[PDB]
From Swiss-Prot:
It comes from Rattus norvegicus. This is Ubiquitin carboxyl-terminal hydrolase 11. Residues 3-108 form the DUSP domain. Belongs to the peptidase C19 family. Monomer. Associated component of the Polycomb group (PcG) multiprotein PRC1-like complex. Interacts with RANBP9/RANBPM. Interacts with BRCA2. Interacts with CHUK/IKKA. Interacts with NFKBIA. Interacts with SPRY3, RAE1, MYCBP2/PAM, and KCTD6. Protease that can remove conjugated ubiquitin from target proteins and polyubiquitin chains. Inhibits the degradation of target proteins by the proteasome. Cleaves preferentially 'Lys-6' and 'Lys-63'-linked ubiquitin chains. Has lower activity with 'Lys-11' and 'Lys-33'-linked ubiquitin chains, and extremely low activity with 'Lys-27', 'Lys-29' and 'Lys-48'-linked ubiquitin chains (in vitro). Plays a role in the regulation of pathways leading to NF-kappa-B activation. Plays a role in the regulation of DNA repair after double-stranded DNA breaks. It is found in: Nucleus; Cytoplasm; Chromosome. The modification N6-acetyllysine is found at residue 169.
Length: 212
């Protein structure tokens, strides 16, 4: 059920010409594989040995255990971006190499710019009153601190009637309370992997971090 080489070229190429819309998923394709696919498709022969095989993004991964992206990857040199539908077509036709996961990234909106966020921020969220339980959660730099707060609340099974707030160590460094929840993680100047401690208000109205 695989289309003509002509159709593949046109359908995938036209895919690349898709305008960025907030919340839409795009996918990374390793440059080498894409060039081989391109060679195959432009060859004009469906039975040619230039058949690219399963989509192989091995060169894009740091390690094949957590499947993190290598740092400092550049669009056009290391990878090509395809929209979700174009990606789905490509996958249906050629499949994924071995146990490789798809590299899905979201289109985000920053003040003045819309872009596919290839490197989202990872935060280490911990409850102040349950420090054994640390969750690594992935956010967007465009996301608000308040969004981090609710996500933490639901990940830590926190009830809705309770007040929570965030503490964090910047690289200055100092431990501060994130009192302005209406700002982006970018305005908050957060590094990926940064520890963020969520605290729940006690019944008496006091905070566990302020018992003195």
């Amino acid at each position: 059920a695989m289309p003509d080489l002509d159709q593949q070229w046109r359908q995938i190429g036209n895919g690349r010409e898709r305008p960025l819309r907030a919340g839409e998923s795009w996918f990374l394709v390793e440059k080498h594989w894409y060039k081989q696919w391109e060679a195959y498709v432009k060859g004009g022969d469906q039975d040619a040995s230039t058949f690219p095989g399963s989509i192989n993004n091995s060169g894009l991964f740091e390690d094949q255990i957590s499947w993190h992206l290598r740092e400092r990857l550049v669009e056009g040199d290391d990878y090509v971006l395809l929209p979700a539908p174009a990606w789905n077509y490509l996958v249906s036709w050629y499949g994924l190499k071995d146990d490789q996961p798809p590299i899905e990234r979201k289109v985000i909106e920053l003040p003045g710019i819309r872009k596919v966020e290839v490197y989202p921020i990872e935060l280490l969220l911990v409850q102040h009153s349950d420090m054994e339980t640390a969750l690594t959660i992935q956010f967007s730099y465009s996301d608000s601190v308040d969004l981090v707060l609710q996500t933490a609340r639901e990940q830590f099974l926190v009830e809705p009637q309770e007040d929570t707030r965030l503490w964090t160590k910047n690289s200055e460094g100092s431990l501060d309370r994130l009192c302005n929840t209406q700002i982006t993680l970018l305005d908050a100047c957060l590094e990926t992997g940064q520890l963020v401690i969520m605290e729940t208000r006690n019944k008496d109205g006091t905070w566990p971090s302020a018992q003195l």
